[PDB]
Amino acid sequence: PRNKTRVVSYRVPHNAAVQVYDYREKRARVVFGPELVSLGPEEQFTV
């Protein structure tokens, strides 16, 4: 079971992109390539 208190992170694959929206800072971001994407308290992944 996932420890809900730990920062949620996703390892983005090579030649892929992830879209995240910060529902509190109101800032949109798309992360390309191999990178570790971590979500702030109110950020959410686009599914």
Partner: protein, 49 residues
């Protein structure tokens, strides 16, 4: 500070309290924690708003 009979007031925060013989403790009351997007609805019963 002065209060009329039947007045309510709130005391808060880091303190010691012993109720004066003229005072009734009505309830224990506690803060509600809320992040920058979270909220509550409150009714001000004196005005109704």
């Amino acid at each position: 500070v002065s209060h009329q009979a039947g007045d309510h007031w709130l005391i808060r925060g880091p303190l010691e309290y012993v109720p004066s013989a003229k005072v009734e403790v009505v309830e224990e009351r506690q803060a509600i924690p809320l992040d920058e997007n979270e909220g509550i609805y409150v009714q001000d019963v004196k005005t109704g708003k």
